Design a protein around this ligand. Sequence first.
Ligand SMILES: [Mg+2]
Ligand SMILES: [Mg+2]
Ligand SMILES: [Mg+2]
Ligand SMILES: [Mg+2]
Ligand SMILES: [Mg+2]
Ligand SMILES: [Mg+2]
Ligand SMILES: [Mg+2]
Ligand SMILES: [Mg+2]
Ligand SMILES: [Mg+2]
Ligand SMILES: [Mg+2]
Lengths: 63, 59, 50, 31, 107
Amino acid sequence: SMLRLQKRLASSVLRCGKKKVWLDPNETNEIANANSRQQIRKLIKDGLIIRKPVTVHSRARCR
Amino acid sequence: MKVELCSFSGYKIYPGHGRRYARTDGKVFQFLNAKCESAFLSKRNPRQINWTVLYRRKH
Amino acid sequence: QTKRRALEKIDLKFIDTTSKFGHGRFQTMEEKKAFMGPLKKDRIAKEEGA
Amino acid sequence: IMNQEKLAKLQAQVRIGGKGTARRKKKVVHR
Amino acid sequence: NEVVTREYTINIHKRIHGVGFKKRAPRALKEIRKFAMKEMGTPDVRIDTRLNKAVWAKGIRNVPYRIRVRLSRKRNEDEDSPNKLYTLVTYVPVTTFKNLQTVNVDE
RNA sequence: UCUGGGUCGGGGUUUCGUACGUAGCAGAGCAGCUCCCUCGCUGCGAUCUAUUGAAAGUCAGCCCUCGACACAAGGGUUUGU
RNA sequence: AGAUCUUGGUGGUAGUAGCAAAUAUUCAAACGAGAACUUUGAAGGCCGAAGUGGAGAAGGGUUCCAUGUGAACAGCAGUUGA
Ligand SMILES: [Mg+2]
Ligand SMILES: [Mg+2]
Ligand SMILES: [Mg+2]
Ligand SMILES: [Mg+2]
Ligand SMILES: [Mg+2]
Ligand SMILES: [Mg+2]
Ligand SMILES: [Mg+2]
Ligand SMILES: [Mg+2]
Ligand SMILES: [Mg+2]
Ligand SMILES: [Mg+2]
C-alpha cells in the first residue's frame, strides 16, 4: 500500500539518498512487510531493492 | 504591362510589389521584399547567397 | 451617376495572380517552372515511373 | 537452462528503465 | 471484428498549435487520448508508458510534430467495469513519415 | 444521395536557406610512415565543393485530392389550433 | 423603536469577491467504496554547495517513531498529515 517507511529505511541501509533507492514495483506487497532494517537488509541481498547508479555527469566535454 | 524590374536578387518584380531605394549618391535599386532589401542593406554579397540569381549563374 | 469619377470606362491591362499565401512572385505555374527549371521532386518523379 | 520461451520473457524483467539505466541483476526468492 | 488493432499516425503539431509552452506536452497526451476515443469509440484508453516517454522525449514545449501510434481495442473481461473494451495505444518508432497510411495490422 | 464528413497520405502554394551520410590530388597546416616513393601515402583539421533551390515546416482559421482507413439513419428533452 | 445603546441570534450583499509572488508537470500500476492531490516505477523539470542539502544555538514541548481512524481540522481533495 504505502512504502514511505521502507524507502526511508532502505536509504539508511544502502547509505545513499532516497533518490537512489529502487523499490520493485512488482513486489510492492513483499516490500511492505519489511518493517525493520534487518528485513530490509535481506530484501537488498535478494534483489527486491536496488541502489540505482549515480546520474552521469561526464567530464569528457571539459577534457 | 509597365516596365518590368529586377531585384537585388535578380528576381522579376511585378508592378505593385516590393519597394524602391534611391540613395543619396544617385543610384536607384528595387527590391522584391524586405528579405532581399535587408540583405542588400547589410551589404551582403548576392554571389554568396545560394537562392540568389547571381549565385546560380556564378556556380 | 453623373460625375466623371463614375461613367468612366475601365480598360484593364494586368491582373495580379501571384500567391497571396505569402510573398508570391510568380503569376502562373508555367512561369514558375520556366524560371526554376526541373527540381528534385520532379527528377525522382521522372525517374521512378520513367 | 535457457530456451526461447525463457529468453523472450527474461528480456522484460532485466529492463527496469529506458535507455541509459542499469539493468536488473537478480530477483531471488528465499524463505 | 471488435478485438481489432490498427496503426495510425497523428499530426500532433496540428492538434497542439496554439498551446502555451508549459502546457504543450500535457495537451499532446490529452489530444492523443481524445484521438483514440474517436477512432476506436471507447472511453477507456490506456496510454503505454513508452508512448508517454516519446511524447516527453524533447521536453515540455518542443513536442514532436508527428507520432506513430498503434491502437489496440482489447477486451476488458477482467473486472466489473462499465466499459467492456479498452484501447491500449502504443508507440511505433519510425524514421520517415512519408507515404505512411493508416494500415490494419494482423496479430 | 446521384453518399457524406473526418484522420492520414499525396499534389500545390509558401517560409527559411542548401540537411545527414558519402566522395574530393579542396583546405592554413601539423603529427607519423621512405627497400619504398624519383614524387609519395597514413592520421587530426574549422571550413569549401558536388550530391542539393536541398533538408525541414506548412491550417491547427491556406488550396486541391478521391489514394488508404475506419466511421457515420444514432442519443436525450420537449412542443397542439 | 431609537441612545454610532448592551448582549445574543439572523438576513440581503452572495454561491458573489475571491482560493493569481517565487518556470511544471505526465504515463502506468497498487491499496482503496471512492485517486488531479496517497504509495511505487518510468519520464520531463526545479533548488544548483552564499541550496528547496546535511547539522546545531535560542524558542517550541512530545510536534519524534510505529499501528489504527476518517467525525472535526489541514480555506479543493485526500486512502495523506506536524
Ligand atoms: Mg497574404
Ligand atoms: Mg499536408
Ligand atoms: Mg428593541
Ligand atoms: Mg445601533
Ligand atoms: Mg468567482
Ligand atoms: Mg485566482
Ligand atoms: Mg538548474
Ligand atoms: Mg539545512
Ligand atoms: Mg511523523
Ligand atoms: Mg479541506
